[PDB]
Amino acid sequence: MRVDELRVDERIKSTLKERGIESFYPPQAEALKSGILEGKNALISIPTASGKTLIAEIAMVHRILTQGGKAVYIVPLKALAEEKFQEFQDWEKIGLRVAMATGDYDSKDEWLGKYDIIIATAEKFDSLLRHGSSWIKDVKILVADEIHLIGSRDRGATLEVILAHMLGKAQIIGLSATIGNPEELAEWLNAELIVSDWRPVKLRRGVFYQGFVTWEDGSIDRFSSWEELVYDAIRKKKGALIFVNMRRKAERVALELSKKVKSLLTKPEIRALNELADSLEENPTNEKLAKAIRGGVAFHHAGLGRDERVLVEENFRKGIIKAVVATPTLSPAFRVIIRDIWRYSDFGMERIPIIEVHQMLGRAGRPKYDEVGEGIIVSTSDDPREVMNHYIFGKPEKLFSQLSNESNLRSQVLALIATFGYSTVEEILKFISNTFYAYQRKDTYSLEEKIRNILYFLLENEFIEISLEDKIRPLSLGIRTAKLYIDPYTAKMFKDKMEEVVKDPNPIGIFHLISLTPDITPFNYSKREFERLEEEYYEFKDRLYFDDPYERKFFRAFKTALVLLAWINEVPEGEIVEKYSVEPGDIYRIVETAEWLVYSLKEIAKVLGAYEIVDYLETLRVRVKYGIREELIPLMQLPLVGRRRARALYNSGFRSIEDISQARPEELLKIEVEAIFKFL
Numbered sequence: 001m002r003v004d005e006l007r008v009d010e011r012i013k014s015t016l017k018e019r020g021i022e023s024f025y026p027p028q029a030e031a032l033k034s035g036i037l038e039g040k041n042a043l044i045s046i047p048t049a050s051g052k053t054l055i056a057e058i059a060m061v062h063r064i065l066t067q068g069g070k071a072v073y074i075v076p077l078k079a080l081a082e083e084k085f086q087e088f089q090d091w092e093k094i095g096l097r098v099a100m101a102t103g104d105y106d107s108k109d110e111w112l113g114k115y116d117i118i119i120a121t122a123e124k125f126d127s128l129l130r131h132g133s134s135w136i137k138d139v140k141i142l143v144a145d146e147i148h149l150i151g152s153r154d155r156g157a158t159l160e161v162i163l164a165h166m167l168g169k170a171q172i173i174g175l176s177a178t179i180g181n182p183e184e185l186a187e188w189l190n191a192e193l194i195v196s197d198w199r200p201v202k203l204r205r206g207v208f209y210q211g212f213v214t215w216e217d218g219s220i221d222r223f224s225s226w227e228e229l230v231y232d233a234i235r236k237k238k239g240a241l242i243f244v245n246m247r248r249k250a251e252r253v254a255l256e257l258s259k260k261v262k263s264l265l266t267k268p269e270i271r272a273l274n275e276l277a278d279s280l281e282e283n284p285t286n287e288k289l290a291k292a293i294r295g296g297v298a299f300h301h302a303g304l305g306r307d308e309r310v311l312v313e314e315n316f317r318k319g320i321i322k323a324v325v326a327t328p329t330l331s332p333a334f335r336v337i338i339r340d341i342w343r344y345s346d347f348g349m350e351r352i353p354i355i356e357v358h359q360m361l362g363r364a365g366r367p368k369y370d371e372v373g374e375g376i377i378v379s380t381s382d383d384p385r386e387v388m389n390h391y392i393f394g395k396p397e398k399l400f401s402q403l404s405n406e407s408n409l410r411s412q413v414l415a416l417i418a419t420f421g422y423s424t425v426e427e428i429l430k431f432i433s434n435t436f437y438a439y440q441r442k443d444t445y446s447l448e449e450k451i452r453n454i455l456y457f458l459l460e461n462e463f464i465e466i467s468l469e470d471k472i473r474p475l476s477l478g479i480r481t482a483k484l485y486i487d488p489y490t491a492k493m494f495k496d497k498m499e500e501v502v503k504d505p506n507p508i509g510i511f512h513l514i515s516l517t518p519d520i521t522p523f524n525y526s527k528r529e530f531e532r533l534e535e536e537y538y539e540f541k542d543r544l545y546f547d548d549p550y551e552r553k554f555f556r557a558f559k560t561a562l563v564l565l566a567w568i569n570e571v572p573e574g575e576i577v578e579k580y581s582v583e584p585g586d587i588y589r590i591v592e593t594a595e596w597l598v599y600s601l602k603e604i605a606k607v608l609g610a611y612e613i614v615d616y617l618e619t620l621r622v623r624v625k626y627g628i629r630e631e632l633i634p635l636m637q638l639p640l641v642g643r644r645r646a647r648a649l650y651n652s653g654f655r656s657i658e659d660i661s662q663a664r665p666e667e668l669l670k671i672e673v674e675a676i677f678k679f680l
Ligand SMILES: Nc1ncnc2c1ncn2[C@@H]1O[C@H](COP(=O)(O)OP(=O)(O)O)[C@@H](O)[C@H]1O
Pocket: 020, 021, 022, 023, 024, 025, 028, 047, 048, 049, 050, 051, 052, 053, 054, 367
């Protein structure tokens, strides 16, 4: 279909044409003629290579221009909201304001009312719905990207919940990978179903087994080693993406490949890569990343800060970095190699889900540069036919509502009571009746039981109250916990230990307490280091708020408190990565969450009259945020600074914002500006 053949405002067609887009893919055409332009809901299951977002953008912009109102675009992760935020920019060229909201849970962000397209994660949007933001009533369409993740245990319940509140109140468009139960999901959504595997660039999938690649079509090709697939890609002027199941694994493989890929690079490429590696922030994890980039290959996993991941992401696009070895969580190229089909799980090593293996292979074949994309699954100790039959011809897993997730369900039952007006068991059960859990007609009895037991726990801890008529009402602790977005249990742990906190409020005691609640995943420790951890604990137990571990979460929480303490004590990131065996990306993630939990602890204190420690906690909140000593807090409002600069400034001079408001710029570059002078 032709962009002009579409029945939508010229302002959409203009934007498209400017994007290079002149014609719609067959799948896109089907979706655009299904009824979405006329407000109907839809579930779009087609290859990512086939422009799923584009269809959502067109449906969103058409909804807005033709009838006003707002459009919500739910993204799976914070970082994916920034990618969607950029590609949505050119919509401001026709007057549409685009906002990005992904955190700061305890606010209603009424300031979002002046926007047309709001990008958010499901949790952020779930919290906004709890605060009752006035503009929410203006959302006429909501797009759920990666809607299949609704079947993911971790956070699939949150996505299901917002989709349950919004259904029948707004147009809903879901974007998902191929799944086992398309019709089921579509029906629950009362949506038009668009299922297709049409792609712009032919994809050939195979299995590499002992020197040979066997393609689904039947042919067999010789390759001395799987890594040869990479070197072959590179010699034909293309690139490769390699997937492994463990960080250190990605790091090892990346370096190994770079050892042979380097000899495959032109002189210019070598320079850029070298300039690229020299331009990386010092620390152990970047050291490795540097060494392999100089060789033309890169690794990528959550262990790297977001800054480094982006650097890899773009330079791979720019064709400078020839290959990228990446782990699944937070990851187009001629060849996509899936090096591992087995992954270490909390359930014990298991095979990567079919659904995920298809998404990985789907990234093979850049629409312009290639006449075909190749997806290769490497089996080391696995029957080649079984791998082929399971991953290339096996129906993808069907999605299962992950609503029963006890942590999400206790936080959600409370949200209904304290922020949505549910005052009866039967009312709560009515909300559940509208979820995908209910539509799948899954375990009904066991869910009720889990809900009554939850109500009890909530009743026993004073978040809510119940009467002899069985009427439920929220108490301040209830309401306050629901608006802070914390797990009722972390509020319960905050409430139980509050007396201990006020008796002796200290970083170690605090950092350890929050690192032990359900809203934070504590750093891991090895058999080796559990040595010191043991001694230090018994050495500091006085400052903690707990009697005696006797247990694994405990010391993981304690290890985390030591990292956090080093963080606020301005210890070099490098020194922390070393002296604690932790990678930068984990530090930030943990710092980010810590700031949020210390804030929530302060707020809970406010609700329990414990106001004397509120200042202390507020102070600690900022220190955790920027990882800085108390006397560096004023200087943090500046454009940029971070613990590094801020310290250099305070010591080598300045201490206030007025102090920088009157320093010879000559005296700043003398150690540290453009942004700063720009800020003033
Ligand atoms: N009809 C089309 N014509 C040309 N390129 C397209 C078309 N649809 C998608 N694309 C390409 O696919 C890229 C992928 O993003 P997008 O289209 O939003 O799909 P997805 O949500 O699967 O990433 C776009 O930036 C563009 O390069």
